[PDB]
Amino acid sequence: FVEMVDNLRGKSGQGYYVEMTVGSPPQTLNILVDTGSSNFAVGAAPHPFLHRYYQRQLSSTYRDLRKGVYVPYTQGKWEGELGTDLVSIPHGPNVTVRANIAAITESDKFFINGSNWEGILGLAYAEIARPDDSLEPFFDSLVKQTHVPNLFSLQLCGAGFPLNQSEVLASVGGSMIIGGIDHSLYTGSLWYTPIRREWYYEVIIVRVEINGQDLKMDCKEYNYDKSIVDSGTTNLRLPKKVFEAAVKSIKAASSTEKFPDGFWLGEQLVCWQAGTTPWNIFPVISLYLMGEVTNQSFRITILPQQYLRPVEDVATSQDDCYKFAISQSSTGTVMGAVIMEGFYVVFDRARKRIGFAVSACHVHDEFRTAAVEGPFVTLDMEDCGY
């Protein structure tokens, strides 16, 4: 899986894209990696933030299916024209697949300026595919048409510092291994949590700690509505009654310093002199996830280094600045790209399970470290579901 290593680029706050070609002859695009939708869609008409876009008029294997499609995201939404065409991944499995492709004709707050991607690959399951589950998502088509196993995995890799458009193009930014696990991406063992159900990648969260302290809530409040792993999500999104309790902790604990109220709502940045950021006053966070054995479970611990998100200075100087990358949700938890940045993540479609290991890629400091640890024998698991 050497040929596959390092095939991502991008960062938490603008997305992790990978290169695909579509069409005959093949046309190149960077596609956003999004495990938290299921449409494969590419931009098709001119767009200020688009430096290239899919051109059907130009590909002899294109197939139009005379059907519209509207995809609303939580914020942002596009409109499109369903069709099919030949697809490949240059730095991925050595195959050509025919796949449903929405041609985006109209866009609102979807695309991201300087993000350097032009489509999105919904890596989730058919049930949530728009217009309807009859639209075979890209990975499904990938597996039915060839010999790639029914698993893919994501190592997403944040810098620990803000990166400019030059540098992100230039950075190696992560790996998508389509159809395999690769040993050089993580340390430790993989611990698996079951996928509850094949729509999103919905997991069950069992317990939450802040610097070892149990947030002490009703189980199901944590997974209220749903709990998903979403690489197409910038932050750790938490249900309001969980958010508020969580933020009360990190506030309690990081008490030695005083932060604007707006840093906590996620909007305003905070800065410290070059290299003097006090990671030490901030708590780590533990997500407890149900295990594959009945009434057994494990844990993922993430540092301020994953949840304080590096952003450029308020005038580009040598200060080190950040946004608080945990925010409110009224749709369940969303284990987003800053959390995912801490682990090697295996989407074992075949075994209905999701893999976690300490990423050979995460940002630590010499005193603490991201962890995947278990087993734990906490009770009351079997009805944390919603």
Ligand SMILES: CC(=O)N[C@]1(CC(C)C)CCN([C@@H](CCc2ccccc2)C(=O)N[C@@H](Cc2cc(F)cc(F)c2)[C@H](O)[C@H]2Cc3ccccc3CN2)C1=O
């Ligand atoms: C705001 C931010 O900083 N970053 C992004 C990520 C950018 C960096 C790539 C931008 C949008 N956004 C959230 C909304 C969060 C938010 C929340 C409140 C306010 C503002 C932002 C989001 O909708 N993500 C979708 C992917 C995506 C990428 C993209 F570029 C454009 C786009 F429209 C969509 C998922 O597929 C999603 C859909 C979904 C749909 C239904 C149920 C669950 C889920 C759960 N998963 C991020 O997290």
